[PDB]
Amino acid sequence: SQSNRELVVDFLSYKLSQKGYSASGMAAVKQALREAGDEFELRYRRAFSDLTSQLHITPGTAYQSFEQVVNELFRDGVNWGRIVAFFSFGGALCVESVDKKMQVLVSRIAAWMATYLNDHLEPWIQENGGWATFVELYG
Ligand SMILES: O=C(Nc1nc2ccccc2s1)c1cccc2c1CN(c1ccc(-c3cnn(Cc4ccncc4)c3)c(C(=O)O)n1)CC2
């Protein structure tokens, strides 16, 4: 969806700027997701397997290789915290890509995240009250 594409670009731009990199609507959802991603990274991430160690992105990486790694994140179903983890993971892949002088990968990871949201997460998001419900719970 257009709104999910906008949330992805917003979150990735926020994370790249936060990590010392140049980063060239639904304001309440964007702010709640930016803050939840920060809280996820500070307080919950280290408990889980580091998914960046399973996906080494290069200009030869296919969407379906990213899809398989992200499927591990949702192995036991979807919840708001695992969706935040997903955005945080995309953020980390972007920062790594810019670090290794592979700027082309930032827009590819953004497209991959939008595809993954469309294919696997949007039905759950709608069923669970939409991004407006995410804001009531975590905003
Ligand atoms: O995420 C993973 N690895 C990553 N590596 C990197 C590397 C770089 C950057 C980012 C990442 S993420 C991972 C890997 C393998 C398996 C699994 C996970 C994540 N899991 C999670 C993730 C969050 C919650 C949860 C649920 N609620 N919360 C709290 C809340 C809610 C809203 N916002 C923030 C925190 C938190 C739960 C859970 O308990 O169900 N499980 C599910 C199983």
From Swiss-Prot:
Changing residue 99 to A: No effect on caspase-1 cleavage. One of its GO terms (cellular component) is endoplasmic reticulum. The chain holds residues 2 to 196 of 233 of the full protein. Potent inhibitor of cell death. Inhibits activation of caspases. Appears to regulate cell death by blocking the voltage-dependent anion channel (VDAC) by binding to it and preventing the release of the caspase activator, CYC1, from the mitochondrial membrane. Also acts as a regulator of G2 checkpoint and progression to cytokinesis during mitosis. One of its GO terms (molecular function) is protein kinase binding. Belongs to the Bcl-2 family. Bcl-X(S) is expressed at high levels in cells that undergo a high rate of turnover, such as developing lymphocytes. In contrast, Bcl-X(L) is found in tissues containing long-lived postmitotic cells, such as adult brain. Proteolytically cleaved by caspases during apoptosis. The cleaved protein, lacking the BH4 motif, has pro-apoptotic activity. Keywords: Apoptosis, Cytoplasm, Cytoplasmic vesicle, Cytoskeleton, Endocytosis, Membrane, Mitochondrion, Mitochondrion inner membrane, Mitochondrion outer membrane, Nucleus, Phosphoprotein, Synapse, Transmembrane, Transmembrane helix, Ubl conjugation. A motif (BH2) lies at residues 123-138. It comes from Homo sapiens. The BH4 motif is required for anti-apoptotic activity. The BH1 and BH2 motifs are required for both heterodimerization with other Bcl-2 family members and for repression of cell death. A motif (BH1) lies at residues 72-91. Changing residue 91 to E: No heterodimerization with BAX. This is Bcl-2-like protein 1. A motif (BH3) lies at residues 29-43. GO terms for biological process: apoptotic mitochondrial changes; apoptotic process in bone marrow cell; cellular response to alkaloid; cellular response to amino acid stimulus; cellular response to gamma radiation; defense response to virus; dendritic cell apoptotic process; dendritic cell proliferation. The keyword Transmembrane helix applies. The keyword Membrane applies. Homodimer. Interacts with BCL2L11. Interacts with BAD. Interacts with PGAM5. Interacts with HEBP2. Interacts with p53/TP53 and BBC3; interaction with BBC3 disrupts the interaction with p53/TP53. Interacts with ATP5F1A and ATP5F1B; the interactions mediate the association of isoform Bcl-X(L) with the mitochondrial membrane ATP synthase F(1)F(0) ATP synthase. Interacts with VDAC1. Interacts with BCL2L11 (via BH3). Interacts with RNF183. Interacts with GIMAP3/IAN4 and GIMAP5/IAN5. Changing residue 119 to A: No effect on caspase-1 cleavage. A motif (BH4) lies at residues 3-23.
